[PDB]
Amino acid sequence: AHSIRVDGDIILGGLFPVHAKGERGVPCGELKKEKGIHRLEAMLYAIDQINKDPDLLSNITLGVRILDTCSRDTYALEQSLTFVQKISGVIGAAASSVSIMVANILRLFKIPQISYASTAPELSDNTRYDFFSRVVPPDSYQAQAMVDIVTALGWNYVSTLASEGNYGESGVEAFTQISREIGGVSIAQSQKIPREPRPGEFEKIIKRLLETPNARAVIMFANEDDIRRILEAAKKLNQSGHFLWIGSDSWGSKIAPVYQQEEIAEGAVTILPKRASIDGFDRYFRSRTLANNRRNVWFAEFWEENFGCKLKCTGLERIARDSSYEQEGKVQFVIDAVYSMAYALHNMHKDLCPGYIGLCPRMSTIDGKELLGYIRAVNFNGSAGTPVTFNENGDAPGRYDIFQYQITNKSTEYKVIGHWTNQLHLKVEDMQWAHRTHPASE
Amino acid sequence: AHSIRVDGDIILGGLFPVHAKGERGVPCGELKKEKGIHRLEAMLYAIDQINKDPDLLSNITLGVRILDTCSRDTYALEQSLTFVQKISGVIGAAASSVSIMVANILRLFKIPQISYASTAPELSDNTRYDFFSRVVPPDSYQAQAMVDIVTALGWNYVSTLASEGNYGESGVEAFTQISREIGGVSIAQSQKIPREPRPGEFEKIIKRLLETPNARAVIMFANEDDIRRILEAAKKLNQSGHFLWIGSDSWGSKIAPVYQQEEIAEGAVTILPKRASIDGFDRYFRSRTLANNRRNVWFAEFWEENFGCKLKCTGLERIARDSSYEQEGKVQFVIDAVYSMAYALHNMHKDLCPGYIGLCPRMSTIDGKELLGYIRAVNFNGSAGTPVTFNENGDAPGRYDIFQYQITNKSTEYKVIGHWTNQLHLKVEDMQW
Ligand SMILES: *[C@@H]1O[C@H](CO)[C@@H](O)[C@H](O)[C@H]1NC(C)=O
Ligand SMILES: *[C@@H]1O[C@H](CO)[C@@H](O)[C@H](O)[C@H]1NC(C)=O
Ligand SMILES: N[C@@H](CCP(=O)(O)O)C(=O)O
Ligand SMILES: N[C@@H](CCP(=O)(O)O)C(=O)O
Numbered sequence: 001a002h003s004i005r006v007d008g009d010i011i012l013g014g015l016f017p018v019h020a021k022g023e024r025g026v027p028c029g030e031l032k033k034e035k036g037i038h039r040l041e042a043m044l045y046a047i048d049q050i051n052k053d054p055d056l057l058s059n060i061t062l063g064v065r066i067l068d069t070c071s072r073d074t075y076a077l078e079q080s081l082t083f084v085q086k087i088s089g090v091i092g093a094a095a096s097s098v099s100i101m102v103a104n105i106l107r108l109f110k111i112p113q114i115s116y117a118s119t120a121p122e123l124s125d126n127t128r129y130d131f132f133s134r135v136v137p138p139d140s141y142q143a144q145a146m147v148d149i150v151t152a153l154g155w156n157y158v159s160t161l162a163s164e165g166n167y168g169e170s171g172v173e174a175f176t177q178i179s180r181e182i183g184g185v186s187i188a189q190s191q192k193i194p195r196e197p198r199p200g201e202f203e204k205i206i207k208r209l210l211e212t213p214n215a216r217a218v219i220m221f222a223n224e225d226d227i228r229r230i231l232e233a234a235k236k237l238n239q240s241g242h243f244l245w246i247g248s249d250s251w252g253s254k255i256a257p258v259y260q261q262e263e264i265a266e267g268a269v270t271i272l273p274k275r276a277s278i279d280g281f282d283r284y285f286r287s288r289t290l291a292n293n294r295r296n297v298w299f300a301e302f303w304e305e306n307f308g309c310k311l312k313c314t315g316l317e318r319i320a321r322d323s324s325y326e327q328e329g330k331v332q333f334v335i336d337a338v339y340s341m342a343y344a345l346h347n348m349h350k351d352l353c354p355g356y357i358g359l360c361p362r363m364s365t366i367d368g369k370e371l372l373g374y375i376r377a378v379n380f381n382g383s384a385g386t387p388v389t390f391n392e393n394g395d396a397p398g399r400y401d402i403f404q405y406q407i408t409n410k411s412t413e414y415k416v417i418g419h420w421t422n423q424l425h426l427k428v429e430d431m432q433w434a435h436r437t438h439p440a441s442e
Numbered sequence: 443a444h445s446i447r448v449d450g451d452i453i454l455g456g457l458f459p460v461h462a463k464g465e466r467g468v469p470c471g472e473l474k475k476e477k478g479i480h481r482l483e484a485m486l487y488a489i490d491q492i493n494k495d496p497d498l499l500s501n502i503t504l505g506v507r508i509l510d511t512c513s514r515d516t517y518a519l520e521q522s523l524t525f526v527q528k529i530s531g532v533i534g535a536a537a538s539s540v541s542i543m544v545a546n547i548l549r550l551f552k553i554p555q556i557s558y559a560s561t562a563p564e565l566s567d568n569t570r571y572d573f574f575s576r577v578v579p580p581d582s583y584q585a586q587a588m589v590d591i592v593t594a595l596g597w598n599y600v601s602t603l604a605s606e607g608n609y610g611e612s613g614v615e616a617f618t619q620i621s622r623e624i625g626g627v628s629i630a631q632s633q634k635i636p637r638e639p640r641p642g643e644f645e646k647i648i649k650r651l652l653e654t655p656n657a658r659a660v661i662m663f664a665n666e667d668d669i670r671r672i673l674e675a676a677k678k679l680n681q682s683g684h685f686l687w688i689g690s691d692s693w694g695s696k697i698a699p700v701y702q703q704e705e706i707a708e709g710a711v712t713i714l715p716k717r718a719s720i721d722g723f724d725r726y727f728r729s730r731t732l733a734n735n736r737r738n739v740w741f742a743e744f745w746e747e748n749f750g751c752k753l754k755c756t757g758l759e760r761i762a763r764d765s766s767y768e769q770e771g772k773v774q775f776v777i778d779a780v781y782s783m784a785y786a787l788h789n790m791h792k793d794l795c796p797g798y799i800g801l802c803p804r805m806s807t808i809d810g811k812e813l814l815g816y817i818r819a820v821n822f823n824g825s826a827g828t829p830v831t832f833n834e835n836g837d838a839p840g841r842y843d844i845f846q847y848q849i850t851n852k853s854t855e856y857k858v859i860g861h862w863t864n865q866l867h868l869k870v871e872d873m874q875w
Contacts, residue, residue: 025569074570078550101546108520127467128516196569 004044004297008063009359010345010366012047012338013083013111015092015102016040018298020225021071024196028070034256035094035224037302038285038328039116040066043091044295045284046338046383057346059358068298069093071223073101073165084109088366089341091334095223096120096167103132110368112375114340116333119249120166121174124393131368133375133394135336136249136273139167139221141398143174145271145420146219146246149402150185152426155244159188159215161205161230163222163250164195171221171248188215193226202226202233209243213438217244224250227257235264241436249273252329253403253414262412265405266434270414274399274421275332276384282327290315336382340390344374398422406432446486446739450505451801452787452808454489454780455525455553457534457544458482460740462667463513470512476698477536477666479744480727480770481558482508485533486737487726488780488825499788501800510740511535513665515543515607526551530808531783531817533776537665538562538609545571552810554817556782558775561691561715562608563616566835573810575817575836577775577782578691578715581609583840583862585616587713588661588688590866591844593626595711597659597686601630601651603672605664606637613663613690630657635668644675651685659686662693669699677706691715694771695845695856704854707847709875712856716841717774718826724769728762778824782832786816840864848874 004014018036022029031037047062065087069076076093080102083090090106090113093099099118106113107130115123115134123129124138150158160175162168172190179185189212191205209218220227227247234243245268251257252272258265290313293299300311307317319325348371353360375390382388390396399421403414418426446456460478464471473479485508493503507529511518518540525532526547531554535541541560548555549572557565557576565571566580592600602617604610614632621627631654633647651660662669669689676685682705689712693699700707732755735741746752749759761767790813795802817832824830832838841863845856860868 074546074549077546081550104516104519104543105547108523 002068002297004040004064004066004295006047006064006295008051008061010060010088011063011065011086012341013087013090013092014040014043014064014066015069015076015080015090015094015098016043016066017071017094017098018068019070027072027075028068031298031301031305032071032256033302033305034254034328037296037298038331039094039334040298041285041288041296042281042331042334043338045281046335046342048284049280050338050342057342057349060345060349062342069095069098071095071098071225073097077101077105080105083111086365087111088345089114089371091337091341092116093118095165096123096170097165099123099132100129100166103129107131112341112368112372114337114375116337117249117330118167120170122166122170124395126393131372133340133372133390135333135340135388135396136330137396137398137400138393139171139174139248141420142248142271142400143171143178144398145400145402145424146175146248147178147183147185148420148424149246149269149271149426150217150219151183152424152428153217155217156184157186157188157212157215158217158219158246159209159212160190160219161193161209161222162191162220163193163226167250168192168221168223172219175219175221188212193222193230197226197229202229203236205230206233206237206239210239210438213440214442216242217246220245220247220251222250224254224256227251228259228261231257231261231264235261240264241434242438245269247271254329255324255326258405258412262407266407267432268405269417270403270405271420272329272401272403273333273396274386274401274419275329276386277327278332278335278383280383281331281335285327286319286321286325288319332382332384332386336388339380339382340375340378340388343378343380344371347378348374402426404431408432443739444510446482446506446508446737448489448506448737450493450503452502452530453505453507453528454783455522455529455532455534456482456485456506456508457511457518457522457532457536457540458485458508459513459536459540460510461512469514469517470510473740473743473747474666474698475744475747476696476770479738479740480773481536481776482740483727483730483738484723484770484773484776485780487723488777488784490726491722492780492784498784499791502787502791504784511537511540513537513540515540519543519547522547525553528808529553530787530810530813531556533779533783534558535560537607538565538612539607541565541574542571542608545574549573554783554810554814556779556817558779559691559772560609562612564608564612566837568835573814575782575814575832577778577830577838578772579838579840579842581613581616581690584690584713584842585613585620587840587842587844587862587866588617588690589620589624589627590862591711591713591868592659592661592688593624594866594868595659598626599628599630599654599657600659600661600688601654601657602632603635603647603651603660603662603664604633605635605668609692610635610663610665614661617661617663630654635664635672639671644671645678647672648675648679648681652681655684658684659688661688661690663690665692666696666698669693670701670703673699673703673706677703682706682708687711689713696771697766697768700847700854704849708849710847711859712845712847713842713862714771714845715775715838716828716843716861717771718828719769720774720777720825722825723773723777724762727769728760728767730761732757774824774826778826778830781822781824782817782820782830785820785822786813789820790816844868846873850874
């Protein structure tokens with residue numbers, strides 16, 4: 001079976017992009033190490049810590065039903081059909097278009113949903129997505145953050161690039177609407193990366209962006225696989241230093257789009273929601289091996305991809321020791337999403353079963369509308385010490401960290417250059433730039 | 443029951459916007475006479491004709507299951523779940539955003555879909571919507587036709603108006619893409635009508651269009667209810683001779699957006715896919731009464747809306763005789779969608795059942811992938827006499843009729859001023875201002 005299934009008292013659903021979308025038609029392709037495995041194992045980590053915890057859900061064990069989405073909303077729709085036939089809540093998904101398609105069918109069967117990565121403004125709708133919630137802020141605030149950064153840098157002439165789907169198109173739309181409403185920020189052109197990219201499509205996009213030579217700055221709402229190929233095409237056409245990249249949360253502080261393409265990505269300003277690196281997950285993930293992690297059905301494929309061998313592999317390899325490892329940026333949000341579900345179940349248990357230590361007969365079948373009420377009313381400190389809470393729409397506060405990709409001597413890092421919390425707090429003095437030429441006649 | 447269920451050998455699904463979307467938290471609202479009932483009854487008419495026909499599907503009766511979409515895609519998704527868990531094929535829907543959501547769930551259970559009104563270019567994609575087909579052409583040709591009409595009339599400065607959803611936004615996007623490449627057409631502003639509009643919204647939209655008074659021409663990709671309220675606000679602010687209206691297929695030759703607002707809609711150039719009025723349906727629909735049409739569950743509500751009475755109503759009222767009636771513009775496409783399904787089942791019957799006059803043991807279960815091939819390869823003269831065919835993508839050819847709303851003395855009509863078949867053919871001599 002191509003699924004992770006662990007039995008418990010209350011079973012929680014899981015949607016993760018373990019594999020990236022295949023090239024042209026093919027549903028599933030290459031494995032996602034950071035975006036897939038790191039986040040998937042973070043849910044398993046959280047559940048293990050909750051079941052261990054004597055205070056949170058005493059004498060109660062959470063179940064597991066993790067399914068692969070293959071970076072496709074169409075593929076995730078038929079996978080989400082297995083949730084409805086027992087599943088009490090769903091953690092996920094990653095991409096907004098994927099979360100939207102699943103939320104359309106979960107609301108009819110009244111199953112609460114908490115996402116860890118989906119940021120599309122449409123998901124804030126309390127009528128169309130009444131059972132949807134998220135521990136990440138909507139793109140309404142991220143677009144405003146990117147407007148402020150562009151204003152501070154004085155780049156009044158910008159181009160926009162987006163991946164086909166809700167996140168890319170409506171994220172850029174949010175940036176465009178703010179530009180038209182207030183300020184002197186003007187948009188040169190809006191390009192869209194197709195969902196099924198043709199051979200040589202990425203080379204054509206770069207050439208299309210060169211049709212406005214004055215527009216050096218590019219606002220980018222694209223997935224990590226698209227960013228890598230955009231930067232690859234920019235290197236292929238010798239456009240080093242020309243484009244000034246502005247990346248959203250899908251870019252973040254990720255190693256995937258910049259791997260082996262460090263020089264072309266220099267000086268790129270990136271956005272990511274307020275998060276911290278969790279030491280607890282790092283200790284757990286490093287201890288995971290081929291021998292002890294049979295629970296993860298995709299871990300064998302991960303082993304082959306992480307160390308670069310065929311199952312050639314000794315089995316005595318260790319993560320972070322034999323290969324490069326850094327915790328994925330949204331690992332915190334996966335853990336905080338599971339805890340938000342757990343605390344809500346704990347709070348519902350206190351009202352329905354006031355005496356019994358464990359699952360009582362009154363809490364035999366979990367009501368979807370009732371559980372959702374406890375999710376929205378929950379208030380606790382997360383896995384990083386940061387408070388986790390939901391508003392009237394079921395969204396997280398608009399809090400962001402701003403990074404810049406910098407190269408010094410030989411080392412590369414995403415240096416924290418500022419943060420956006422209701423208003424901008426950018427340090428221009430700490431920003432570094434690469435050396436440049438395209439003449440204009442307009 | 444809130445649906446029409448007629449049992450047969452092969453059951454066909456139907457999705458029709460009987461009611462419009464509600465105002466507040468309400469899902470279903472006002473009953474649409476033309477867009478809803480006329481088209482719904484056209485499917486029932488088509489099925490009645492096929493069952494009567496001794497040549498097409500001999501000794502085989504087609505069943506039907508028609509559901510209400512209530513103009514909402516989220517409501518239509520709930521209804522479309524009753525088709526799955528037997529349905530061999532689904533006919534519908536009208537709106538593109540509705541058809542898209544339905545096509546997402548039908549492909550998983552391999553149920554072929556033929557639409558009569560949905561024109562969004564996204565639906566042409568063979569990877570995303572592999573089981574979707576349509577007897578109407580995509581908006582990519584309709585947007586090009588609009589650019590040609592705008593260029594020929596000498597309207598270099600234009601404004602765009604779109605209803606929230608796949609049809610409005612992608613229809614305007616396609617227009618903008620062609621206008622961005624060409625030099626003869628330039629866009630002043632792009633307005634978007636909200637899906638859930640607040641009070642006083644339509645008057646604000648008109649005021650925003652008046653911010654650029656040189657842009658008199660307005661290209662509209664809006665639904666029946668949205669066009670009406672746009673024209674209502676324009677009449678309210680006395681903007682009669684100022685605006686020049688360009689209407690898409692959702693405007694067409696319909697009377698619903700222009701009812702009691704004839705003066706404001708004068709000289710409006712509208713487009714519609716090539717169609718003809720069918721005499722066979724008109725004879726059928728005029729004979730439909732409260733007494734004989736118990737089949738249609740919404741017909742009692744339609745009767746109150748059509749004649750303006752309460753069940754006040756005598757029952758002796760007659761359609762066309764007592765109330766103003768004209769066949770809806772897309773009635774042909776509904777009928778041709780059913781015949782496309784019928785001929786495909788007829789051609790599959792010939793290959794699977796050698797010489798049987800009826801269902802053979804091999805025709806026990808209808809394979810969706812196999813039926814899809816017979817739908818795409820179908821070739822027949824339709825209900826209007828015009829040929830019905832599908833291409834590699836599953837689309838009809840980009841053939842359109844161009845109309846203009848003209849007023850003479852007291853009479854009002856949508857006069858044919860030209861047609862678009864890959865190239866523009868506009869008759870300037872038949873236009874009035
Ligand atoms: C936990 O639950 C089990 C089974 O219901 C029961 O036997 C046990 O006594 C419980 N333990 C505690 C500490 O309440
Ligand atoms: C129609 O089908 C029925 C039942 O299978 C059969 O009895 C009858 O002979 C058929 N009619 C003709 C004209 O073949
Ligand atoms: N907000 C993004 C997901 C961020 P990721 O690429 O998973 O790191 C989306 O909704 O598509
Ligand atoms: N082409 C339109 C439908 C036209 P109608 O308003 O049903 O007459 C759409 O795709 O939404």
